């Protein structure tokens, strides 16, 4: 009864430093998507606006409201103002009067106006540009310089942006742009109330061994308006576990928190959680009532997942160093997944429906695993409810990456109350299950990518333990002691803290995790990949479909070394690297349209992004239950990148507005509870067997050849005692190259490709799967396909009926920006005939697509 809580999101006023311009603004709310909702500006990521909209980042705006409040003044004791995210700067005027300023985007904001709110109140936020923000705070740190004191010229961006606690990648990366923005882009609210507030609850289920039982740790912080103690009872009930539970508190203006610790009854039983793939997600609806002297009752709900967490470095015999695997509610799991940067340069754009869509894709890939990468934000609270509720984990970074830090009184200050804010929200969700300092900040000391005196770095390292181990760390266990923590990703873990916090070698494979980037050689020989403990990042470029930078180009920018496209490449020698990377196995396009050339070059970038992924990840995944030459046992494959944050060439599956690059496509099938990986070593063709089912199977496989000029199968070797132990990965096949050819007469490295699959269970998924014998632009008998569509409806789906001329490699379905994907695409079409579906996200017709459709395969880029 004593509680009085509504929201100020809507319509606010928004002007410019000289007040030349006004106009309306929502919130949550930008700048830009303000100035181009109401027209002042185009959409700016349309070509080049990223340099001619520099104006925007660099002025000082206000965003303004004018309110009447709906309650009486003399009903309510205390009066405070909420802001649950500013971005980032900001001077808070309420009747002018400053009441409180800002400076980290990453934590919510309370403020007293109780001596201040009058009848009618006007709320100004004056914002100061992030960007010359983050330059007086650089020229402020005289002791000595924190590098990168600005991004590559490739990149087009903004300096200094570690100087200021905003998302590290607003000001550009290298496939990001550099749009700091301002603005107010969490919820904000007017709350009064008497006798007592809640500033905040967190709780915290675990398991206690010494209890063989389960545990609910609660917290919850008060604000007490009266000098005068308060009493109460509060009550926990799980209804579901039959659990109620009552006891006495008391609260005053400095005991003004509750501990409380739930005991769950061991005669009921307690389902627990487990990733997609592996388990179920469920939860318990759960009540805390809280009954205070006056009659003031405050209830909050929330679901209440069980789960346990196990990050396990142990040894491994005949392998020296320690093991990186997790262990959930005691069951090894293999991670597999990508990693997640920010779905938009302007959050108040990233909708609900965007991100329910996005992780529709994420889940139809046969993901179990995001990495919420430290470059970008800690997500909206939907975020980590769908990754609860969907069953995806969650590798958490904190927003530090790739960058060195202040120690400065002030940033610590500011760090401390984000990390204290963030993790006491995030804490309670069971998807994550890894705390992770920063970004490759240990590797850019380990090895001084920022190339500092060593006479400075003991400096520089002091400042690393400061912040990731004194600070963050010492914050992170004092709430949490469930989940695994590491101060850097990549790590060696316990090695890493036995070394003083900085590991000798942190891209060691022997401890810890890695990430691994080449460029330089051939990705289909899978040597050069290292046979670590965990890969928590990996991947290559290329550029989205044509229909997605259409949106954003002009007809003259539709060249692959355009002005546009060369802008739009954020990382060094991209583009040479890509088609470095096509010509290792593919023909250059040889047209003479120049359109064609720039849609068939982004085709094969495609092609050779989905190829070498699929053969990186297949080496990880089999490479799960062996030890060879000292190295193994690979348990998680987290590719480089999810998604895009606009239009242009990145590491992603997910084209920025969600359409599926050709590598989503295949990650569906290499990603699947059972496949089979084919591979050759010196001359012996192998196949190893990959599952992550929780029982042994019992399957069949069938290998089989075919030339390029018919579908027919010169081979058809079948083995029936075919069995994969559980999670694990074994060889199943091995057969010398010449004497595999023998077997199926007729049939060259360069003439022949092999087909492999297992029996399909009908109740699990196992794709086929291929290996190329020879490069294919070296093939020979490969005659051009010729493929014809007849699409037809069925439901809320499209049905694709195909028929080839041959054997099509690469088969590529587009139908430009029609909201969907296929069930499948990309792949080594063998028969003549085949049908793939297609499933909308928004009200599509048969015409509609029909027109925009469009079919390619390999033979036709050259
Ligand atoms: C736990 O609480 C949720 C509410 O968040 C319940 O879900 C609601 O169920 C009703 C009818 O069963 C629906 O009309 C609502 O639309 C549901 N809401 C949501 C948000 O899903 C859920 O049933 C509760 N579970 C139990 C076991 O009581
Ligand atoms: C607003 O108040 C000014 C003096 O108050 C001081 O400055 C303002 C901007 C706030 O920061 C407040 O906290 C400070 O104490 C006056 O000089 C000015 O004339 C006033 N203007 C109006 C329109 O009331
Ligand atoms: C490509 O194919 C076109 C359509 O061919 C028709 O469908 C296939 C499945 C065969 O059954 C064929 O007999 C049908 O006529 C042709 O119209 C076209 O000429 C072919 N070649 C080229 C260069 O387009
Ligand atoms: C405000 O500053 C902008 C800077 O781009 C300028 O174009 C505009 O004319 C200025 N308006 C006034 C009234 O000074
Ligand atoms: C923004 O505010 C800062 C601090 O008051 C000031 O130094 C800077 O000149 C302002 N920028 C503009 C474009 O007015
Ligand atoms: C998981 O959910 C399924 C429903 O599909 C149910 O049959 C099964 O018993 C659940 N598992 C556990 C351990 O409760
Ligand atoms: O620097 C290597 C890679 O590291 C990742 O953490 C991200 O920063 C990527 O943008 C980058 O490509
Ligand atoms: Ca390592």
Redesign the pocket.
């Known amino acids: 009864h004593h509680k009085l809580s509504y929201s100020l999101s809507g319509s606010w006023r928004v002007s410019n430093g000289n007040g030349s311009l006004e106009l309306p603004a929502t919130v949550p709310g930008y700048v830009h998507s303000a100035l181009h909702q109401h027209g002042l500006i185009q959409d700016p990521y349309y070509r080049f606006n990223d340099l001619n909209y520099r104006w925007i980042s660099l002025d000082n705006w206000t965003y303004s409201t004018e309110f009447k409040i709906p309650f009486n003044l003399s009903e309510w004791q205390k009066v405070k103002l909420i802001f649950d995210g500013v971005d980032t700067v900001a001077e808070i005027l309420f009747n002018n009067v400053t009441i409180g300023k800002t400076d980290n985007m990453f934590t919510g904001y309370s403020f007293d106006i109780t001596n201040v709110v009058k009848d009618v109140n006007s709320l100004k936020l004056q914002f100061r540009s992030a960007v010359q923000y983050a330059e007086c705070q650089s020229k402020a740190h005289t002791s000595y310089r924190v590098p990168p004191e600005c991004p590559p010229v490739e990149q087009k961006g903004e300096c200094h942006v570690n100087f200021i606690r905003k998302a590290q990648c607003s000001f550009s990366?290298?496939?990001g742009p550099s749009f700091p923005s301002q603005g107010i882009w969490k919820d904000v609210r007017i709350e009064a109330y008497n006798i007592a507030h809640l500033d905040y609850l967190t709780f915290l289920p675990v398991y206690d061994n010494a209890s063989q039982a389960w545990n609910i740790e609660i917290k919850a912080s008060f604000d007490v308006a009266s000098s005068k103690s308060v009493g109460g009872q509060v009550t926990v009930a799980i209804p579901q576990l039959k659990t109620q539970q009552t006891n006495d508190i008391e609260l005053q203006q400095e005991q003004r928190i509750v501990k409380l610790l739930v005991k769950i009854r061991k005669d009921v039983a307690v389902e627990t959680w487990w990733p997609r793939g592996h388990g179920n997600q469920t939860g318990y609806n759960m009540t805390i009532l809280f009954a205070l002297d006056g009659g003031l009752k405050i209830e909050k709900a929330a679901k209440v997942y069980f789960r346990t967490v196990q990050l396990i470095e142990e040894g491994i015999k005949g392998s020296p160093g320690l093991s990186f695997y997790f262990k959930i509610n005691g069951l090894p799991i293999f991670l597999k997944g990508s990693?997640w940067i920010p779905a938009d340069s302007f959050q108040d754009k990233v909708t609900s429906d965007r991100l329910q869509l996005l992780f529709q894709s994420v889940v139809d890939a046969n993901m179990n695993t995001l990495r919420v990468?430290?470059?970008g934000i800690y997500e909206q609270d939907e975020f980590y409810a769908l990754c609860d509720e969907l069953g995806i984990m969650v590798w958490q970074d904190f927003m530090f990456?790739?960058a060195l830090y202040p120690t400065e009184p002030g940033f610590l200050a500011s760090v401390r109350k984000e990390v204290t804010y963030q993790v006491r929200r995030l804490k309670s969700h069971p998807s994550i299950i890894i705390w992770s300092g920063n970004?490759?900040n240990e590797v850019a000391l380990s090895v001084n990518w920022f190339h500092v005196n060593p006479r400075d770095m003991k400096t520089y390292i002091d400042d690393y333990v400061t912040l990731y181990v004194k600070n963050i760390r010492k914050i992170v266990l004092s709430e949490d002691k469930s989940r695994p923590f590491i101060a850097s990703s990549p790590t060696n873990g316990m090695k890493t803290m036995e070394e003083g916090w900085i590991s000798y070698d942190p891209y060691s494979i022997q401890y810890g995790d890695i990430?691994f980037?080449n460029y330089a050689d051939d990705c289909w020989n899978w040597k050069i990949f290292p046979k670590a403990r965990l890969v928590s990042?990996y991947?290559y470029q290329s550029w989205p479909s044509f229909s997605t930078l259409e949106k954003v180009s002009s007809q003259e920018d539709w060249a692959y070394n355009s002005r546009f496209s060369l802008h739009r490449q954020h990382?060094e020698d991209g583009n040479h690297q890509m088609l470095h990377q096509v010509k290792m196995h593919f023909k250059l396009p040889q047209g003479t349209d120049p359109l064609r050339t720039f849609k068939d070059t982004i085709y094969l970038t495609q092609v050779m992004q989905a190829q070498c992924i699929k053969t990186e990840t297949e080496f990880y995944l089999r490479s799960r239950s062996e030890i060879v030459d000292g190295k193994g046992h690979t348990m998680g494959a987290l590719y480089?990148?999810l998604n895009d944050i606009w239009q242009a060439p990145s590491?992603a599956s997910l084209e920025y507005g969600g359409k599926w690059k050709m590598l989503h496509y295949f990650a569906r099938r290499f990603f699947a509870p059972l496949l089979p990986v084919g591979f050759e070593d010196e001359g012996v063709f192998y196949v190893y067997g990959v599952s992550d089912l929780h029982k042994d199977h019992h399957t069949q496989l069938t290998v089989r050849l075919h030339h390029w000029s018919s579908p027919k199968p010169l081979c058809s070797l079948v083995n029936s005692s075919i069995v994969v132990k559980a999670g694990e990965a074994v060889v199943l096949f091995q057969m010398p190259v010449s004497e595999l050819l023998k077997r199926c007469r007729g049939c060259t490295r360069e003439t022949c490709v092999v087909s492999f699959y297992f029996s399909t269970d009908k109740e699990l998924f196992s794709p086929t799967n291929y290996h190329f014998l020879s490069s294919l632009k070296d093939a020979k008998g490969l005659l051009e396909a010729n493929i014809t569509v007849n699409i037809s409806q069925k439901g809320n789906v499209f049905v694709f009926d195909l028929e080839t001329s041959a054997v099509a490699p690469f088969v590529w379905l587009d139908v430009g920006s029609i909201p969907g994907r296929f069930s499948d695409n990309g792949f080594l079409m063998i028969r003549k005939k085949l049908s793939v579906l297609f499933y909308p996200w928004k009200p599509t017709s048969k015409s509609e697509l029909q027109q925009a459709f469009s079919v390619t395969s390999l033979t036709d880029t050259y």
Do not use: V
């Open positions: 990366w290298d496939w990693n990468w430290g470059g990456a790739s970004n490759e990430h980037y990042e991947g990382h480089w990148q590491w």
